[PDB]
Design an enzyme around this catalytic site. Structure first.
Site, PDB file in Angstrom:
ATOM      1  CB  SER A 171      69.182  18.585   7.228  1.00  0.00           C
ATOM      2  OG  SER A 171      70.458  18.550   6.618  1.00  0.00           O
ATOM      3  N   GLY A 172      67.734  20.011   9.718  1.00  0.00           N
ATOM      4  CA  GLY A 172      66.481  20.471  10.313  1.00  0.00           C
ATOM      5  C   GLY A 172      66.473  20.327  11.822  1.00  0.00           C
TER       6      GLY A 172
ATOM      7  CG  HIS B 252      67.705  20.388   2.320  1.00  0.00           C
ATOM      8  ND1 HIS B 252      68.278  20.933   3.459  1.00  0.00           N
ATOM      9  CD2 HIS B 252      67.887  19.044   2.346  1.00  0.00           C
ATOM     10  CE1 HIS B 252      68.815  19.920   4.111  1.00  0.00           C
ATOM     11  NE2 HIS B 252      68.602  18.763   3.484  1.00  0.00           N
TER      12      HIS B 252
ATOM     13  CG  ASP C 106      68.028  24.375   3.976  1.00  0.00           C
ATOM     14  OD1 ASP C 106      66.855  24.228   3.531  1.00  0.00           O
ATOM     15  OD2 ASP C 106      68.802  23.427   4.202  1.00  0.00           O
TER      16      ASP C 106
HETATM   17  N1  LIG Z   1      77.630  17.843   8.527  1.00  0.00           N
HETATM   18  C1  LIG Z   1      77.130  17.961   7.120  1.00  0.00           C
HETATM   19  C2  LIG Z   1      77.139  19.442   6.620  1.00  0.00           C
HETATM   20  O1  LIG Z   1      76.635  20.291   7.681  1.00  0.00           O
HETATM   21  C3  LIG Z   1      75.713  17.383   6.892  1.00  0.00           C
HETATM   22  C4  LIG Z   1      74.671  17.559   7.825  1.00  0.00           C
HETATM   23  C5  LIG Z   1      73.383  17.050   7.583  1.00  0.00           C
HETATM   24  C6  LIG Z   1      73.180  16.339   6.390  1.00  0.00           C
HETATM   25  C7  LIG Z   1      74.218  16.110   5.465  1.00  0.00           C
HETATM   26  C8  LIG Z   1      73.989  15.303   4.232  1.00  0.00           C
HETATM   27  C9  LIG Z   1      74.957  14.368   3.793  1.00  0.00           C
HETATM   28  C10 LIG Z   1      74.742  13.588   2.637  1.00  0.00           C
HETATM   29  C11 LIG Z   1      73.532  13.740   1.927  1.00  0.00           C
HETATM   30  C12 LIG Z   1      72.548  14.651   2.366  1.00  0.00           C
HETATM   31  C13 LIG Z   1      71.246  14.844   1.578  1.00  0.00           C
HETATM   32  O2  LIG Z   1      70.176  14.646   2.526  1.00  0.00           O
HETATM   33  C14 LIG Z   1      68.826  14.979   2.286  1.00  0.00           C
HETATM   34  C15 LIG Z   1      68.352  15.240   0.981  1.00  0.00           C
HETATM   35  C16 LIG Z   1      66.996  15.578   0.764  1.00  0.00           C
HETATM   36  C17 LIG Z   1      66.103  15.624   1.844  1.00  0.00           C
HETATM   37  C18 LIG Z   1      66.558  15.361   3.153  1.00  0.00           C
HETATM   38  C19 LIG Z   1      67.918  15.062   3.395  1.00  0.00           C
HETATM   39  C20 LIG Z   1      68.363  14.731   4.843  1.00  0.00           C
HETATM   40  C21 LIG Z   1      69.433  15.650   5.424  1.00  0.00           C
HETATM   41  O3  LIG Z   1      69.797  16.729   4.706  1.00  0.00           O
HETATM   42  O4  LIG Z   1      69.934  15.434   6.528  1.00  0.00           O
HETATM   43  C22 LIG Z   1      72.795  15.443   3.506  1.00  0.00           C
HETATM   44  C23 LIG Z   1      75.483  16.646   5.719  1.00  0.00           C
END
Ligand SMILES: N[C@H](CO)c1cccc(-c2cccc(COc3ccccc3CC(=O)O)c2)c1
Length: 230
Positions: free
Chosen positions: A183-184, A41, A89
């Protein structure tokens, strides 16, 4: 990372900053000399921009001898991944060349035995994601130890209501949690990569919405096949 603290510089040599047009977008994990594992994502609304991977970093902005920005030669999202879905993902990124290895740049061994991490186990999550609900972005790498939450508790109607498959794991999200920009990145238990941070319900620091992490062991065959296709 909410409720965490600044990581010791270069103590996580596998930690990567997946970047879009020079800006930190997502975390990543160096899993082989030329490959970085991240979340699919992350590159969904990127298709145009320059995707690069920053290795050996503590600070995103400051010069460091170990810091090196690499170009990506090919992006391999998991073939079963769908946009705005939390399943499969995963994303594999092939660097421009094999990363220069040293004390600050080193791939992390990942779990190949498909068995859940015991609930209550403290696992280390690191990232350059937001450090407060106001969206403050840290310059330096943060980390937090989080306890693994059993899938049954995570799957309750009050929590993630059946969405946690056998390919996903949960960690407690009370105050301390992974958040946007994390994320990632990795979830490490006893020095081994167990999970890759996903965005879940896009809610952070709420105990009723635990952190969701993709179990790497569930994707051992796919990771091996992608790493073997030089
Ligand atoms: N702990 C919780 C659930 O596990 C958690 C962990 C990690 C991220 C989020 C989270 C919170 C709010 C908005 C977004 C959208 O972010 C992106 C959208 C598009 C590209 C990249 C990103 C960056 C990303 O995903 O980190 C993610 C929530």
């Amino acid at each position: 990372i909410l409720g965490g603290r600044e990581a010791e510089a270069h103590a996580r040599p596998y930690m990567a900053s997946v970047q879009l047009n020079g800006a930190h977008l997502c975390g990543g994990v160096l899993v082989a000399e030329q490959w970085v594992l991240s979340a699919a994502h992350c590159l969904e609304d990127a298709a145009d921009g320059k995707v690069q991977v920053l290795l050996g970093a503590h600070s995103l902005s400051q010069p460091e001898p170990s810091k090196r920005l690499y170009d990506v030669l090919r992006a391999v999202p998991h073939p079963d991944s769908q946009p705005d879905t939390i399943d499969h993902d995963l994303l594999l990124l092939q660097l421009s060349e094999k990363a220069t290895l040293g004390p600050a740049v080193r791939p992390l061994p990942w779990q190949r035995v498909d068995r859940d991490v015991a609930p209550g186990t403290l696992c280390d999550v690191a990232g350059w994601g937001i450090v407060n609900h106001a969206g403050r972005r840290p310059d330096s790498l943060q980390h937090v130890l989080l306890p693994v939450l059993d899938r049954a508790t995570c799957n309750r109607r009050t929590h993630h209501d059946g969405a946690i498959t056998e390919r996903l794991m949960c960690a407690e999200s009370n105050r301390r949690d992974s958040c946007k920009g994390d994320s990632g990145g990795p979830l490490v238990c006893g020095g081994v990569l167990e999970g890759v941070v996903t965005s879940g319900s896009r809610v952070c620091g709420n105990r009723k919405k635990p952190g969701i992490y993709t179990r790497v062991a569930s994707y051992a065959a796919w990771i091996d096949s992608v790493l073997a296709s030089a």
